[PDB]
Paper text:
FtsEX is a transmembrane signaling complex that coordinates periplasmic peptidoglycan remodelling with cytoplasmic cell division events. pneumoniae, FtsEX interacts directly with peptidoglycan hydrolases such as PcsB, but in Escherichia coli, and other gram-negative bacteria, FtsEX interacts with a periplasmic intermediary, EnvC, that activates downstream amidases.
Crystals of the EnvC-FtsX periplasmic domain complex belong to space group P212121 with two molecules of the FtsX periplasmic domain and one molecule of EnvC in the asymmetric unit. Occupation of the amidase-binding site by the restraining arm strongly suggests that EnvC has been captured in an autoinhibited state that would necessitate a conformational change in order to bind and activate its cognate amidases. The two interfaces are mostly hydrophobic and dominated by interactions arising from the X-lobe (residues 145 to 171) which partially wraps around each of the two long helices that make up the EnvC coiled coil. Phe158 is notable for its position at the tip of the X-lobe where it slots between the two antiparallel helices of EnvC, locking each FtsX domain in place.
Author numbering:
A (entry chain C): 110 to 206
B (entry chain B): 109 to 209
C (entry chain A): 40 to 419
Write the structure that this text describes.
Amino acid sequence: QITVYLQKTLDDDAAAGVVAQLQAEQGVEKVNYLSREDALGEFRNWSGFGGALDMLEENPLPAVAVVIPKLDFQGTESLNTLRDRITQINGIDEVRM
Amino acid sequence: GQITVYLQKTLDDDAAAGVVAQLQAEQGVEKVNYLSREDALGEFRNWSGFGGALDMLEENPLPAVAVVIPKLDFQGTESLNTLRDRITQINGIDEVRMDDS
Amino acid sequence: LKSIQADIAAKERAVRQKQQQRASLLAQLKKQEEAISEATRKLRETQNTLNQLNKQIDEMNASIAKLEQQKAAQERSLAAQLDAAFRQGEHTGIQLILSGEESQRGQRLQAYFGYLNQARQETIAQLKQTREEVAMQRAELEEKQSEQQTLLYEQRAQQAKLTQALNERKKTLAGLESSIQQGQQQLSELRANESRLRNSIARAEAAAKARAEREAREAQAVRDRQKEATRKGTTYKPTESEKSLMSRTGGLGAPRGQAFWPVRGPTLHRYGEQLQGELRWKGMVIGASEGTEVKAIADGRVILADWLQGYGLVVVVEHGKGDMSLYGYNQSALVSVGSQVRAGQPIALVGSSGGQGRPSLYFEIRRQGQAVNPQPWLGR
């Protein structure tokens, strides 16, 4: 699985667009979405830093997409190519393995 | 299950000592470890966190802290709730945190 | 024979005493009105600079108060974050970063810690930036306050010069009001005052001639260069400065009420009316408040700004072709000799310099070295 993080500037509609856009990018089985608001809940619950994010004037977290590759695209070179595909959809910030 | 208490920041040294003595006198308390506002700052200042933040603040941003260590026979759930109830009624207490667990 | 001879020599002594006491009071009046004029001009220029500086200082204090509010808000917010971090044990008990981690939840939990560390870096950078803008705007404000204080110091000095000169003038005129001037020596002073004024204009003119002659040549070259334009089937557009040169040197033209009123007010005396005995007014007198601005009637250059007995502070503006406008009785000359002036520009403030009974403007137009009725140039 490669995790991609969205630009924080995406509104509700624009986020919905990115979600629709990555449904059938080559080599991707499924993509899981976490809200800015859900991502924040998850840090406060599970990081053991409590409200450290909450203490900022702005939510510093983006809404996020976890790319689950198809079983025939789980090899080293497969993951590199499908990672390179995400780069061509402008509006994603960072891609991690 | 130690209870960490944070003092109101307007408490002087005497008033703080009073709160500390009231915590020490409470049923089921073994010891109380106290850190001054001035000592709490000394300790935090060592931290690399928020680099350059404290040089820009004229005022100590931190509270005094007292860690209330209960006796071994008052470390059960209901024991800690009662001791918490009594600690929270002591004047000069701002916040009470129960052990992480 | 003895005591008639004592009284003859004590009646000539007494006339040479009166004449020299008057001469000395008039030289004091000249000096006082010169000081009132120079000080009135400075206080005017000073006050105008100050009005600009005070507006800047007001703006800077408003801008600094805004940033100071911002800085206090940013400090309190930052201090609340440090406090919450300390209550969390983030400075010792980081341990909760380690034992709380999963396969993919821990992956995100790391990314999230990256966004938090970034946000904290930005918070501190924002406050550092607010403190730098504040400190800089305060440095700039202190330099503007220092400039303002030097100006208020100049205002104080000039005001002191003016107040002194006014106090001393009150005493000189009371003195001059004491020396009753009989009919025939008034007429004598009036004729001699007119003659001295004539000599002062000629000397100012003599000193302007080189410049006036060059500018006229240069001005005609423009008119000429527009002949080659017309007569060779084109138009030459003269520059804005060539247009100014032609205006300043072309004279006042035919009297058709085209010139600016130097001041508006009742016409108290007209050219040709009786001045005293058989002496006639060679100009007009227009009544107006002390300090009323006197306007150049037309484009030209100042060639005289002197105190002259009977006329007080006199400004003469060269218009070219031997045409001059003359402005007397002034409180203050607002322009120096050699300064170019624009139609409608303030050149003086109305007064009663030279010992007039009321504030007014003395106004002449001269052509070919002769005062003429100035009335028919006045319109706008």
